[PDB]
Design an enzyme around this catalytic site. Structure first.
Site, PDB file in Angstrom:
ATOM      1  N   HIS A  40       0.842  -1.225   0.000  1.00 27.65           N
ATOM      2  CA  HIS A  40       0.000   0.000   0.000  1.00 27.65           C
ATOM      3  C   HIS A  40       0.864   1.257   0.000  1.00 27.65           C
ATOM      4  CE1 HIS A  40      -0.049   0.191   4.582  1.00 27.65           C
ATOM      5  NE2 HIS A  40      -0.292   1.515   4.348  1.00 27.65           N
ATOM      6  N   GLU A  52      19.165   7.290   8.442  1.00 31.04           N
ATOM      7  CA  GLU A  52      18.351   8.413   8.984  1.00 31.04           C
ATOM      8  C   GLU A  52      18.164   8.240  10.490  1.00 31.04           C
ATOM      9  OE1 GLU A  52      17.666  11.013   7.744  1.00 31.04           O
ATOM     10  OE2 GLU A  52      16.952  10.959   5.658  1.00 31.04           O
ATOM     11  N   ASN A  54      17.066  11.795  12.554  1.00 33.83           N
ATOM     12  CA  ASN A  54      16.212  12.978  12.307  1.00 33.83           C
ATOM     13  C   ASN A  54      15.896  13.028  10.804  1.00 33.83           C
ATOM     14  OD1 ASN A  54      15.170  15.565  11.856  1.00 33.83           O
ATOM     15  ND2 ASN A  54      16.048  16.288  13.777  1.00 33.83           N
ATOM     16  N   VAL A  57      16.490  16.576   9.128  1.00 29.55           N
ATOM     17  CA  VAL A  57      17.802  17.277   9.282  1.00 29.55           C
ATOM     18  C   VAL A  57      18.890  16.334   8.757  1.00 29.55           C
ATOM     19  CG1 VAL A  57      19.448  18.286  10.969  1.00 29.55           C
ATOM     20  CG2 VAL A  57      16.996  18.649  11.295  1.00 29.55           C
ATOM     21  N   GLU A  62      23.562   9.420   6.442  1.00 27.93           N
ATOM     22  CA  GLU A  62      22.485   9.061   5.484  1.00 27.93           C
ATOM     23  C   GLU A  62      23.116   8.437   4.238  1.00 27.93           C
ATOM     24  OE1 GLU A  62      22.774  12.270   6.685  1.00 27.93           O
ATOM     25  OE2 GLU A  62      20.856  12.717   7.653  1.00 27.93           O
ATOM     26  N   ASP A  84       0.009  -7.531   1.785  1.00 27.41           N
ATOM     27  CA  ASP A  84       0.499  -6.130   1.861  1.00 27.41           C
ATOM     28  C   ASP A  84       2.027  -6.135   1.929  1.00 27.41           C
ATOM     29  OD1 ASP A  84       0.555  -3.422   1.842  1.00 27.41           O
ATOM     30  OD2 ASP A  84      -0.243  -3.132   3.889  1.00 27.41           O
ATOM     31  N   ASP A 171       1.358   1.111  20.120  1.00 30.29           N
ATOM     32  CA  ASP A 171       1.008   0.618  18.772  1.00 30.29           C
ATOM     33  C   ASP A 171       1.877   1.316  17.740  1.00 30.29           C
ATOM     34  OD1 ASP A 171      -0.441  -0.963  16.947  1.00 30.29           O
ATOM     35  OD2 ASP A 171      -2.367   0.063  17.410  1.00 30.29           O
ATOM     36  N   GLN A 174      -0.235   5.704  11.654  1.00 27.88           N
ATOM     37  CA  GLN A 174      -0.142   6.299  10.293  1.00 27.88           C
ATOM     38  C   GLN A 174       1.283   6.815  10.107  1.00 27.88           C
ATOM     39  OE1 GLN A 174      -3.276   6.282  12.035  1.00 27.88           O
ATOM     40  NE2 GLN A 174      -3.634   4.809  10.366  1.00 27.88           N
ATOM     41  N   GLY A 175       1.933   6.413   9.004  1.00 27.18           N
ATOM     42  CA  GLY A 175       3.307   6.804   8.631  1.00 27.18           C
ATOM     43  C   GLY A 175       4.346   5.774   9.064  1.00 27.18           C
ATOM     44  N   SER A 177       3.707   2.536   8.297  1.00 23.53           N
ATOM     45  CA  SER A 177       3.420   1.488   7.286  1.00 23.53           C
ATOM     46  C   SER A 177       4.691   1.146   6.530  1.00 23.53           C
ATOM     47  CB  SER A 177       2.379   1.929   6.270  1.00 23.53           C
ATOM     48  OG  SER A 177       1.116   1.929   6.878  1.00 23.53           O
ATOM     49  N   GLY A 178       4.892  -0.148   6.270  1.00 18.72           N
ATOM     50  CA  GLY A 178       6.004  -0.677   5.464  1.00 18.72           C
ATOM     51  C   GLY A 178       7.212  -0.923   6.331  1.00 18.72           C
TER      52      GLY A 178
HETATM   53  C1  LIG Z   1       0.805   5.545   4.991  1.00 20.17           C
HETATM   54  C2  LIG Z   1      -0.228   5.513   6.042  1.00 20.17           C
HETATM   55  O1  LIG Z   1      -0.463   4.120   6.386  1.00 20.17           O
HETATM   56  C3  LIG Z   1      -0.008   3.692   7.570  1.00 20.17           C
HETATM   57  O2  LIG Z   1       1.104   3.935   7.977  1.00 20.17           O
HETATM   58  C4  LIG Z   1      -1.079   2.935   8.370  1.00 20.17           C
HETATM   59  C5  LIG Z   1      -0.484   1.963   9.405  1.00 20.17           C
HETATM   60  C6  LIG Z   1      -1.540   1.635  10.455  1.00 20.17           C
HETATM   61  C7  LIG Z   1      -1.100   1.156  11.828  1.00 20.17           C
HETATM   62  N1  LIG Z   1      -2.237   0.995  12.749  1.00 20.17           N
HETATM   63  C8  LIG Z   1      -2.186   0.296  13.879  1.00 20.17           C
HETATM   64  N2  LIG Z   1      -3.240   0.201  14.676  1.00 20.17           N
HETATM   65  N3  LIG Z   1      -1.065  -0.312  14.214  1.00 20.17           N
HETATM   66  N4  LIG Z   1      -2.081   2.260   7.542  1.00 20.17           N
HETATM   67  C9  LIG Z   1      -3.193   2.909   7.185  1.00 20.17           C
HETATM   68  O3  LIG Z   1      -3.126   4.083   6.828  1.00 20.17           O
HETATM   69  C10 LIG Z   1      -4.544   2.284   7.438  1.00 20.17           C
HETATM   70  C11 LIG Z   1      -5.600   2.641   6.601  1.00 20.17           C
HETATM   71  C12 LIG Z   1      -6.884   2.163   6.824  1.00 20.17           C
HETATM   72  C13 LIG Z   1      -7.137   1.343   7.898  1.00 20.17           C
HETATM   73  C14 LIG Z   1      -6.108   1.010   8.750  1.00 20.17           C
HETATM   74  C15 LIG Z   1      -4.824   1.485   8.540  1.00 20.17           C
HETATM   75 CA   LIG Z   2      18.543  12.903   8.525  1.00 23.00          CA
END
Ligand SMILES: CCOC(=O)[C@H](CCCNC(=N)N)NC(=O)c1ccccc1
Ligand SMILES: [Ca+2]
Ligand SMILES: N=C(N)NCCC[C@@H](NC(=O)c1ccccc1)C(=O)O
Ligand SMILES: NC(=[NH2+])NCCC[C@H](N)C(=O)O
Ligand SMILES: [Cl-]
Ligand SMILES: [Cl-]
Ligand SMILES: [Cl-]
Length: 223
Positions: A40, A52, A54, A57, A62, A84, A171, A174-175, A177-178
């Site tokens: 995704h 990386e 910071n 900066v 890097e 995924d 947990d 968002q950000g 991911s991957g």
């Molecule tokens: C690029 C943004 O994606 C991500 O990092 C997140 C990671 C989610 C981690 N959540 C936890 N509870 N650990 N992915 C999404 O956004 C997502 C979408 C729709 C539904 C769920 C997640």
């Molecule tokens: Ca840096």
């Protein structure tokens, strides 16, 4: 990462940032030329950033290397987030040092209860938005396939596992991911999805890397 801590500079040497003019996903260096991230996180003209701490900066450890190939799992489903996983080939080989290194692939699936390290520059707030400058780290156990399915009825495939705390408070978010989930010295997970971050009975859901080892090795060999 919510309820995590400051890793320390280059203490997660396999942690990379995928940048499209800005950080939008993490990734895991698995050898000199290859990164595993989430399907995704796919987009055109990815720059990979290694060494990386910071991310806003220049600190002087890097390496910036363009993606020459981005290979999404053939059965990736953007709706279910099944499969995924993505492989990114680097245009040149990374230089090995104490601060930039690969993490080993699994030879086996890890057990519920095994402690994992989860890292990233994602949201640190479960309510609102805060992006850290420096890499955050979380220790989180693999949860039972049973309590994962109980938390996310009709959503957990055999390519997904839960890690974290059913009480919430810690947990991925968002950000992140991957990004890597590393347990007993092996890459067992990719940050994929969850309902919110750090909420009760809503643990993080991770791509189950141990199912993809043979696809990863074949892809690397062919490319
Ligand atoms: C690029 C943004 O994606 C991500 O990092 C997140 C990671 C989610 C981690 N959540 C936890 N509870 N650990 N992915 C999404 O956004 C997502 C979408 C729709 C539904 C769920 C997640
Ligand atoms: Ca840096
Ligand atoms: N397949 C190749 N042409 N490889 C060359 C390796 C050069 C370089 N890189 C590492 O050995 C390394 C391995 C894992 C993570 C990071 C770097 C080196 O000589 O430093
Ligand atoms: N259970 C843990 N995750 N412990 C590590 C937290 C950070 C570490 N105690 C420090 O002083 O920097
Ligand atoms: Cl196994
Ligand atoms: Cl289990
Ligand atoms: Cl079910």
């Amino acid at each position: 990462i919510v309820g995590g801590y400051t890793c320390g500079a280059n203490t997660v040497p396999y942690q990379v940032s995928l940048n499209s003019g800005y950080h939008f996903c993490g990734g895991s260096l698995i050898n000199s030329q290859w990164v595993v991230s989430a399907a995704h996180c796919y987009k055109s003209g990815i720059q990979v950033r290694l060494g990386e701490d910071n991310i806003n900066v220049v600190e002087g450890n890097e390496q910036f290397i363009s993606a020459s190939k981005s290979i999404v799992h053939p059965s990736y489903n953007s709706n279910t987030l099944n499969n995924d996983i993505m492989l990114i080939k680097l245009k040149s080989a990374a230089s090995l040092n104490s601060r930039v290194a690969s993490i080993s692939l699994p030879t086996s699936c890890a057990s519920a209860g095994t402690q994992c390290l989860i890292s990233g520059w994602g949201n640190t707030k479960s309510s609102g938005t805060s992006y850290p400058d420096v890499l955050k780290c979380l220790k989180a156990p693999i949860l039972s396939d049973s309590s994962c399915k109980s938390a996310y009825p009709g959503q957990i495939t055999s390519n997904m596992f839960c890690a974290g705390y059913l009480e919430g408070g810690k947990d991925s978010c968002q950000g992140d991911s991957g990004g890597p989930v590393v347990c007993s010295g092996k890459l067992q997970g990719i940050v994929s999805w969850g309902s919110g971050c750090a909420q009760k009975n809503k643990p993080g859901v991770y791509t189950k890397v141990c199912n993809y080892v043979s696809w990863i090795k074949q892809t690397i060999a062919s490319n």
